[PDB]
Amino acid sequence: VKKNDLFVDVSSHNGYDITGILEQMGTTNTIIKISESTTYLNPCLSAQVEQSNPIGFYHFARFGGDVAEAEREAQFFLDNVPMQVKYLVLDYQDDPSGDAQANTNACLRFMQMIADAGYKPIYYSYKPFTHDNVDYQQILAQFPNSLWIAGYGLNDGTANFEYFPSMDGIRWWQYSSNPFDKNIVLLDDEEDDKPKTAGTWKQDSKGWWFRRNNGSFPYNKWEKIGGVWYYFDSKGYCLTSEWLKDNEKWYYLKDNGAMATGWVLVGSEWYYMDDSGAMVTGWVKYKNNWYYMTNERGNMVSNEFIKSGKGWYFMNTNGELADNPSFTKEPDGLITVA
């Protein structure tokens, strides 16, 4: 998954048919509860897996500050993972011991076991609980960017940045439990690897071209190099800082030639590209500000509305804001947080 992707998490509380909530959410990405303590198994697991695309599984911790107990709970959890996924989650939100350090050590041991088993560990919880029961900085120290934090705000079923939890290392954000658990991704998954790069970059008077291993070079085409997409013109030079229309969609090649994905600054304007690099039109929110972007006839426009209090103010390209808000009722567009 990538920044702003969405996923739902479920347990027996969601039953044996989760097709509905997945349709409502608009995604099949799930994180399913497997176990709790050392004796409980979510009976809806097989069904929920069958009906979705799990990106991970979670375990409801009952070990408190007991390291030996944490180890047993972790093994029971591992022994029941039904399929390979990138993440295994430690849901630590209840039964903490009075010793905050003990709690932390137990959580660290649980997470270390998940790591040793070949998965990426994730600590899930809510801010105040974490503040009062563990030293999350110690957790992040051992496992960077491993937090999945819950913060619902008004809990009206939508992601409202005003109540975004303020903590370091947050990878995912459970923004609501109304009607079911909703989550948005803050960081792309890690890709710990050594890119191959089947060739050598060459820079001449005109620009950059790529000499493939066989001596040829890409021209009039998209080509992924070192795991990055670039577009080469008719003469073999990759485009830089340029808009490109390809197959009815608009892409933007950045100053380094790489295809833009997510928010990208073009000049002084903000545009948003989906994970495929294709521009997204209409209303898109970035944290607290709203943008209405269009590309009719290749005329790229980014209408920016800056939030201030309970209102949003249109900003003229001259950088001047209106005296009064343009709107106070937010449009129902795409919500991004990173």
| C-alpha–C-alpha distance, residues 250 and 96, integer Å | 51
| C-alpha–C-alpha distance, residues 291 and 313, integer Å | 11
Q: Hey, what's the torsion of the CAs at 243, 247, 249, 251, to 10 degrees? A: -30
Distance set, CA 193 to CA 182, 198, 226, 289, 326 (Å)? 31, 15, 11, 35, 47
Six-digit token string for 65: 């500050």
Query: Do the beta carbons of residue 45 and residue 85 sit within 8 Å?
Result: no
Q: Hey, what's the torsion of the CAs at 92, 96, 99, 100, to 10 degrees? A: 30
| C-alpha–C-alpha distance, residues 107 and 118, integer Å | 17
Coil, helix or strand at residue 4: coil
Distance set, CA 92 to CA 106, 136, 251 (Å)? 10, 12, 42
Six-digit token string for 25: 């959410």
| C-alpha–C-alpha distance, residues 71 and 108, integer Å | 10
Resolution in Å, one decimal place: 2.0
Distance set, CA 213 to CA 172, 197, 204, 326, 334 (Å)? 40, 9, 18, 55, 42
Half-sphere exposure of 163 (CA within 13 A, CB side): 18
| C-alpha–C-alpha distance, residues 44 and 313, integer Å | 47
Query: Do the beta carbons of residue 11 and residue 35 sit within 8 Å?
Result: no
Q: What are the φ/ψ torsions at residue 162 (nearest 5 degrees)?
A: -55, -30
| C-alpha–C-alpha distance, residues 84 and 14, integer Å | 22
| C-alpha–C-alpha distance, residues 177 and 183, integer Å | 9
CA-atom Rg of the chain in angstroms:
23
Q: Which of 286, 287, 256 is nearest to 273 (CA)?
A: 286
For residues 100-113, b (16+ Cβ closer than 10 Å) or e, as one string? bebbbbbbbbbbbb
DSSP classification of residue 220 = S
| C-alpha–C-alpha distance, residues 23 and 17, integer Å | 12
Query: Do the beta carbons of residue 135 and residue 99 sit within 8 Å?
Result: no
Please give the span between the terminal C-alpha atoms of the chain, in angstroms, as a whole number. Answer: 13
Structure determined via: X-ray
Task: Return the bridge partners of 176, or none.
Answer: 182
Own/partner contacts of 29-32, CB < 8 Å, gap of 24 or more, are: 29/1, 29/5, 29/53, 29/54, 29/55, 30/54, 30/55, 31/7, 31/55, 31/56, 31/57, 31/58, 31/87, 31/89, 31/183, 32/57, 32/58
Specify burial of residue 128 (Cβ count, 10 A radius: 0-12, 13-18, 19+).
exposed
Query: Do the beta carbons of residue 33 and residue 59 sit within 8 Å?
Result: yes
Q: Which of 119, 121, 15, 16 is nearest to 61 (CA)?
A: 121
Query: Do the beta carbons of residue 304 and residue 272 sit within 8 Å?
Result: no
Q: Which of 139, 143, 134 is nearest to 65 (CA)?
A: 134
Domains and CATH numbers, the chain: 1-187 (3.20.20.80), 199-280 (2.10.270.10), 281-338 (2.20.120.10)
DSSP strand pairing (289-294 vs 301-308): antiparallel
For residues 266-277, b (16+ Cβ closer than 10 Å) or e, as one string? eeeebbbbeeeb
Half-sphere exposure of 233 (CA within 13 A, CB side): 13
DSSP classification of residue 187 = S
Query: Do the beta carbons of residue 316 and residue 306 sit within 8 Å?
Result: no
Q: State which H helix or E strand residue 332 sits in.
A: none
| C-alpha–C-alpha distance, residues 4 and 198, integer Å | 31
Q: Where are the alpha helices (DSSP H) in the chain?
A: 19-25, 45-50, 67-78, 100-116, 127-133, 136-142
Looking at the chain, how many residues does it have?
Answer: 338
Q: Which amino acid is at 231?
A: Y
Coil, helix or strand at residue 272: strand
Six-digit token string for 147: 């937090």
| CA angle in degrees (0–180, nearest 5) for 220-223-227 | 160
**Residue 159 CA, distance from chain mean position:** 13
Q: State which H helix or E strand residue 249 sits in.
A: strand 249-253
DSSP strand pairing (120-126 vs 87-91): parallel
Q: What are the φ/ψ torsions at residue 319 (nearest 5 degrees)?
A: 75, 20
Q: Is the peptide bond before 179 cis (omega within 30 degrees of 0)?
A: yes
Tokens 């801010």 belong to residue: 127
Q: Which of 338, 214, 216, 229 is nearest to 278 (CA)?
A: 229
Distance set, CA 303 to CA 149, 291, 328 (Å)? 32, 5, 16
Residues 6+ apart with CB under 8 A from 25: 6, 8, 180, 182
DSSP strand pairing (334-336 vs 282-286): parallel
